[PDB]
Amino acid sequence: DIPFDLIQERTGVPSSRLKVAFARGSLRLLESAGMQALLFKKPLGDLEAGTVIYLGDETEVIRGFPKIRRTLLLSPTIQEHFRDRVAVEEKMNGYNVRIACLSSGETVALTRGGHVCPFTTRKAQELLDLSEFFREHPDLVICGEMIGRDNPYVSQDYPEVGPLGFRVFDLREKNTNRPLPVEERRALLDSYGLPNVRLFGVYPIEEAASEVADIIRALGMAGREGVVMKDPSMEVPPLKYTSSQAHARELAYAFSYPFDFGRPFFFSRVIREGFQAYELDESDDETRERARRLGEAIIYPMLERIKSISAGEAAYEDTVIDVEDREAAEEFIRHLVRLGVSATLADYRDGRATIRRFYQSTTDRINNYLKGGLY
Amino acid sequence: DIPFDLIQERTGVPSSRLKVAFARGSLRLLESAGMQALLFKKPLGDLEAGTVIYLGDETEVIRGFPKIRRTLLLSPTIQEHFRDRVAVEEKMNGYNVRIACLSSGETVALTRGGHVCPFTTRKAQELLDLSEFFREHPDLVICGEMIGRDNPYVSQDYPEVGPLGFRVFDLREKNTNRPLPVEERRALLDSYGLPNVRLFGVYPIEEAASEVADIIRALGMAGREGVVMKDPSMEVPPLKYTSSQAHARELAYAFSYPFDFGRPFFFSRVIREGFQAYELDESDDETRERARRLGEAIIYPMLERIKSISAGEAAYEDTVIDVEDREAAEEFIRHLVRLGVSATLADYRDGRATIRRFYQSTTDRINNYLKGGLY
Ligand SMILES: Nc1ncnc2c1ncn2[C@@H]1O[C@H](COP(=O)(O)OP(=O)(O)OP(=O)(O)O)[C@@H](O)[C@H]1O
Numbered sequence: 115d116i117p118f119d120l121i122q123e124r125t126g127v128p129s130s131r132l133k134v135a136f137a138r139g140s141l142r143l144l145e146s147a148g149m150q151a152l153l154f155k156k157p158l159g160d161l162e163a164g165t166v167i168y169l170g171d172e173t174e175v176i177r178g179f180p181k182i183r184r185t186l187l188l189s190p191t192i193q194e195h196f197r198d199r200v201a202v203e204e205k206m207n208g209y210n211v212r213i214a215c216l217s218s219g220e221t222v223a224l225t226r227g228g229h230v231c232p233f234t235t236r237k238a239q240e241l242l243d244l245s246e247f248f249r250e251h252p253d254l255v256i257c258g259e260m261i262g263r264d265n266p267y268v269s270q271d272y273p274e275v276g277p278l279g280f281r282v283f284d285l286r287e288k289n290t291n292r293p294l295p296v297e298e299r300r301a302l303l304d305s306y307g308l309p310n311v312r313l314f315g316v317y318p319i320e321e322a323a324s325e326v327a328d329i330i331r332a333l334g335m336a337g338r339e340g341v342v343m344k345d346p347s348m349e350v351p352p353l354k355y356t357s358s359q360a361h362a363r364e365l366a367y368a369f370s371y372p373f374d375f376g377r378p379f380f381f382s383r384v385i386r387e388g389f390q391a392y393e394l395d396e397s398d399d400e401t402r403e404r405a406r407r408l409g410e411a412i413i414y415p416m417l418e419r420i421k422s423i424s425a426g427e428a429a430y431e432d433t434v435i436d437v438e439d440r441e442a443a444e445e446f447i448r449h450l451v452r453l454g455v456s457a458t459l460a461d462y463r464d465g466r467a468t469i470r471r472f473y474q475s476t477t478d479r480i481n482n483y484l485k486g487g488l489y
Numbered sequence: 490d491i492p493f494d495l496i497q498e499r500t501g502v503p504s505s506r507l508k509v510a511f512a513r514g515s516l517r518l519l520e521s522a523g524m525q526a527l528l529f530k531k532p533l534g535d536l537e538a539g540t541v542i543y544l545g546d547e548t549e550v551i552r553g554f555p556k557i558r559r560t561l562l563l564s565p566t567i568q569e570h571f572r573d574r575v576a577v578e579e580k581m582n583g584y585n586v587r588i589a590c591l592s593s594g595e596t597v598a599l600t601r602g603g604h605v606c607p608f609t610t611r612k613a614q615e616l617l618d619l620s621e622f623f624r625e626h627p628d629l630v631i632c633g634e635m636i637g638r639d640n641p642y643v644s645q646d647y648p649e650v651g652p653l654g655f656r657v658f659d660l661r662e663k664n665t666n667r668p669l670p671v672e673e674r675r676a677l678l679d680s681y682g683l684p685n686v687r688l689f690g691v692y693p694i695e696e697a698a699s700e701v702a703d704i705i706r707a708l709g710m711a712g713r714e715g716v717v718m719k720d721p722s723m724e725v726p727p728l729k730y731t732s733s734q735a736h737a738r739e740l741a742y743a744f745s746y747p748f749d750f751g752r753p754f755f756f757s758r759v760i761r762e763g764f765q766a767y768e769l770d771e772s773d774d775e776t777r778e779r780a781r782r783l784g785e786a787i788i789y790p791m792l793e794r795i796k797s798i799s800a801g802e803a804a805y806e807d808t809v810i811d812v813e814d815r816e817a818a819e820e821f822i823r824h825l826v827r828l829g830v831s832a833t834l835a836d837y838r839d840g841r842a843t844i845r846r847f848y849q850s851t852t853d854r855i856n857n858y859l860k861g862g863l864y
């Protein structure tokens with residue numbers, strides 16, 4: 115049974131609160147070296163959502179990755195949040211991965227919720243040489259973005275990393291979740307042959323907002339997601355800010371399965387376009403492009419989705435991945451499913467498993483409308 | 490001391506559910522001129538929102554105007570819903586008015602929430618000649634839209650009415666809320682010289698959808714709101730269906746005050762554009778124009794609003810109305826304020842009265858960000 119007082123000491127959360135959280139947002143589950151773990155679905159105190167506690171030789175807290183705040187404007191805001199210098203990295207469109215070595219020597223890759231992903235743990239050690247880093251730094255949690263076209267979670271092709279890849283943006287200590295300063299982190303990860311997310315530079319605070327403006331113009335015309343700005347000694351939390359095309363991308367995806375994204379959502383992205391038009395457009399023409407790009411991202415995917423279902427096709431998405439065997443693919447399917455995702459194996463040849471995700475609500479509601487159902 | 494048993498007898502709503510509604514709202518007020526009345530803020534049993542019960546020499550239940558269902562498609566939805574024939578009237582973009590001659594001889598214009606508008610009651614009596622109609626039909630509630638560019642509530646130019654006119658779209662019995670048949674209701678209002686909404690015609694159900702499509706194309710090309718489809722006998726409830734410019738107009742106004750409406754306003758309207766592109770757009774040119782039209786309606790109002798607030802202006806809405814005197818103008822404001830509206834008299838020249846509406850949600854949140862406040 116759950117060692118509530120031990121956890122109370124390791125976390126700073128009173129054993130009383132923890133029993134209140136065992137009503138709802140605190141799950142006990144088997145994972146790793148026959149080990150019993152606790153997964154904080156909801157945040158609780160200093161503890162972040164996605165926090166996982168492993169109850170082994172030592173009880174290790176794998177803190178959840180912290181929510182990064184958003185800004186819609188580069189100025190005055192950057193000068194209003196930061197001090198002296200701003201480090202500016204590339205925002206990787208992928209899925210958040212915390213890699214840790216546990217007291218059992220076992221290496222584990224946590225999805226944002228704190229679940230171990232069988233696919234992510236396999237691929238993370240396949241594509242990363244972690245052995246020596248963890249021998250020397252076993253209480254540092256590698257925080258990164260799994261990216262690439264053959265990505266079961268968020269699929270964007272970053273050709274320079276291959277079909278599947280990884281990029282570290284953080285080193286955070288177990289339990290305390292304290293980050294290493296930016297430039298030390300990059301160096302340390304360099305000297306173990308580990309990949310850092312692209313860093314555009316470190317700029318004095320006066321010039322930061324303009325420097326970020328050019329980068330974003332560059333990132334947009336490349337079709338990349340955007341930027342994450344950081345206090346070089348991480349004594350100020352980060353701010354994220356994204357490109358217009360990044361917003362058209364998400365929106366276009368969202369209006370392809372419009373009834374699976376819980377309403378706004380949609381408002382939040384569009385609003386980013388208002389303030390960004392106010393700040394980055396240097397001609398009416400550009401603002402015109404911005405409008406055209408927004409309309410088309412909305413109409414055309416929704417028009418094709420509707421045509422599709424009209425022609426008998428249910429709304430689905432496929433993503434072909436590398437797996438070890440068909441059993442492995444199946445196990446990953448189950449994991450997506452216990453995450454509330456409609457998924458099945460659609461095809462399997464050698465080690466390549468076609469993961470099929472179904473969007474039931476988009477299929478149903480567009481069918482009911484096409485048959486004469488009333489809004 | 491309210492006569493709940495009487496109101497139960499006169500509405501069929503159980504006495505208990507009434508007292509429980511009143512313990513919240515449902516609200517008891519004085520109106521016209523020394524009568525006490527019951528306003529139903531939310532629906533209850535068969536009672537509609539905005540239903541008012543007048544307690545006079547007679548107990549009269551001025552029923553609220555029923556919510557009209559909407560379709561996103563003409564086909565096959567019309568023929569799944571209607572039978573035999575389909576009557577198709579213009580949907581007029583203004584505000585809802587219920588005119589009735591209460592048992593105390595006093596004529597009262599009710600807005601959708603069942604409040605007596607001092608403006609609308611004065612405007613309806615100037616505009617319409619109602620004395621001979623109500624003399625013959627005191628128990629008939631005239632239901633129509635007040636429309637025109639110089640409108641106090643929602644404003645759109647309709648040349649046919651100059652600055653401001655009225656158009657009846659329904660006749661409904663007091664208490665029962667039963668609607669007269671379409672062709673009868675129209676003949677009746679004509680013989681008494683009362684203005685009808687344009688009725689394009691009654692079509693058999695197999696031709697209804699293609700007919701409506703043609704009306705919709707003309708109405709869109711002409712900047713008109715859409716169509717309300719009716720069973721001639723009114724035995725099946727109406728379906729409203731709106732055009733794309735109705736929507737652009739709607740989303741443009743929406744994003745001039747983004748944080749005051751919704752969040753959708755946006756997903757609701759945009760979803761119409763999808764199915765309508767599907768059913769009605771015949772060339773991709775048309776769909777392209779639809780996308781661009783939708784984009785500009787979103788960015789531009791949002792953009793100007795941020796510029797407007799960056800330059801120090803509050804987010805407001807002006808509208809100019811024709812009033813009798815300035816005494817009239819200030820009564821109308823006192824009226825808007827007692828309904829929760831942040832309005833003032835911006836200006837008054839020669840019977841004209843600039844009514845200014847403030848939207849502080851939009852002003853505050855847009856200023857919070859321009860000050861460098863985090864998303
Ligand atoms: N260079 C980077 N630095 C930090 N985070 C990054 C970087 N590149 C990608 N990310 C990922 O982007 C996330 C923030 O971007 P996004 O808005 O897509 O995530 P989110 O789901 O909104 O996360 P949250 O709201 O919890 O911050 C981070 O949580 C991280 O997973």
Ligand SMILES: [Mg+2]
Nearest residue numbers: 581582583584
């Ligand atoms: Mg209307």
